[PDB]
Amino acid sequence: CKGKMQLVADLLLLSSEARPVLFEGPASSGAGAESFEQCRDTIIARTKGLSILTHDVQSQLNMGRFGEAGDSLVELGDLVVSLTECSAHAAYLAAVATPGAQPAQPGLVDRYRVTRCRHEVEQGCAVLRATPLADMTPQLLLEVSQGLSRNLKFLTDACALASDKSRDRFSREQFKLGVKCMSTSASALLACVREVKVAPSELARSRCALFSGPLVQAVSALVGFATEPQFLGRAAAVSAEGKAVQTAILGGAMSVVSACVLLTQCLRDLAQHPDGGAKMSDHRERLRNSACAVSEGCTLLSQA
Amino acid sequence: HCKGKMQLVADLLLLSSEARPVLFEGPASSGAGAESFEQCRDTIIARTKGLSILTHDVQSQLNMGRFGEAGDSLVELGDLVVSLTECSAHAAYLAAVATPGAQPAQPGLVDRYRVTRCRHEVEQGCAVLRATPLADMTPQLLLEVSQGLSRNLKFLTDACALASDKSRDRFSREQFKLGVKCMSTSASALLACVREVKVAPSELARSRCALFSGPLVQAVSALVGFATEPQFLGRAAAVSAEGKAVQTAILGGAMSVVSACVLLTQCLRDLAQHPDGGAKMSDHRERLRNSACAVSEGCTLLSQ
């Protein structure tokens, strides 16, 4: 049951390390219709939440309340994710607010989001593959099936929009065909997930693994097609000052993420021999690291 | 180039005729749909005659240097050997079950041999779409690939429809349908790309065709994999030792024929480098021998 904490202090780590796909590259709006000031306020809120959750998870671990610590981590991960996205967006807005800037131009789809969705679909199917039978509980399968259901819902909407925005016949129809393929694959798999749920057996499980391939491939093909170079639009064109302004904020946000990562590993570290815990300083140092990182983050938002 | 066009055939033929030996190893099942032993034997006689003819034809046509003709002769030889193989297998089954204490085979929801072949051919087609460089992707090759895939997919669809009907399980009954839907949508998605790379050739379109190949292969693999689950497979015939002997004989003879024609293919393949200076016309002549004698064995083990 303490294992359930190593789990989180890992899926969380990867969840928050994946998001640094916004911290390296060009300048694009990392969000949907918000202004810089509001965004910075959001970041402030997140950092507050971060202080709170840092303390909470710390004390909850040091109490021996692992089940709570886990959820606290989950929330911390989600919070760091949000903070990262907002940081990226604020960096972009600050960048384009600069004198001679030209704004970015949207692709047919949001690359970052669909990339995330592909990653999540692959993760879900991986979970269906790597889970042993008796461990495939009716709740786990429902969670996986629900996660696949959102991801597919988002991809479907995105590709619908992309189809609409397309002014070429082939692309317009290809998006639709790809969507149909994706949906049928999904249905086929989810049937198997329901079957292995109601009538568990090794056959049904291997079946669930069998019908995972078509969905992963479908989504990979659709996303691959959706991100063809001519569909990608354009990153913003900004002066050196803009890029500096953006680099700063991205730096701070990266500081936060890295600090929280080190904290996560430190949480995972003591989850073997807690009573002994010869490494009590390492854990405590990351509260500080995170706090200072948050300070940098706040520093580069008020100045630029 | 035109002798170049012959490596292709003297290879796809070999694999086409070596793949069909999926009827030459295993248990005893009807390898055809509703024919009697005598008629089957007659068919085999006809095939062997045709085989003698085509043996000569391809031999002389090569030794004349008329390669384009030799190629087509090979193709027809391949098709003929395939037919002979199927008939031989069926005759072996019929002879086996004609034995005193035999119990006949019982059909699975689908014909394993055919769907296996179809999966193999879909994979082959998609492989061809992947490994062909642009401009070698001629408007005829794409049409050929497309029609092949369409032919295999039509068969798979009909078979799985029948399987859905014959199913006595709700889940299986529905799963066949879902799998078919998935297969068809994937197919459509891919064939669209095949049409695009044909009308508007480019590297993008080509890589696209390769991109949209995965979902179809996986769809077919999942559907075929599911269709051949152990509880769907039915039963092989239960025959005495004499029956099995009787079958072993015929399968042996037919295997002799196939192996001989394989070696002949290789001998034809051998001389397509230095025809003017090829000391091994004897290797080539010997396979006439092997094939003829093999045909004799085949006929021998058919009379009893």
Residue numbers in the entry:
A (entry chain A): 40 to 343
B (entry chain B): 39 to 342
Excerpt from the paper describing this PDB structure:
Talin rod domain–containing protein 1 (TLNRD1) shares 22% homology with the talin R7R8 rod domains, and is highly conserved throughout vertebrate evolution, although little is known about its function. Here we show that TLNRD1 is an α-helical protein structurally homologous to talin R7R8. Like talin R7R8, TLNRD1 binds F-actin, but because it forms a novel antiparallel dimer, it also bundles F-actin. Increasing TLNRD1 expression enhances filopodia formation and cell migration on 2D substrates, while TLNRD1 down-regulation has the opposite effect. Together, our results suggest that TLNRD1 has retained the diverse interactions of talin R7R8, but has developed distinct functionality as an actin-bundling protein that promotes filopodia assembly.
The first 40 residues of TLNRD1-FL are not visible in the density, supporting the secondary structure prediction that the N-terminal region is unstructured. The TLNRD1 structures reveal the basis for TLNRD1 dimerization, which is mediated by a novel interface on the four-helix bundle. In both the TLNRD1-FL and TLNRD1-4H structures, the four-helix bundle forms an extensive interaction with a four-helix bundle of a second TLNRD1 molecule. An identical dimer interface was observed in both the TLNRD1-FL and the TLNRD1-4H structures, which crystallized in different space groups. However, the structure of TLNRD1 revealed that the putative actin-binding surfaces on α2 and α3 are positioned facing away from the dimer interface, raising the possibility that TLNRD1 might engage two actin filaments simultaneously, and thus cross-link and bundle actin. Thus, it is possible that this more compact conformation might represent an autoinhibited conformation of TLNRD1, rendering some binding sites cryptic. The structural information from equivalent talin complexes was used to model the RIAM- and KANK-binding sites onto the TLNRD1-FL structure.
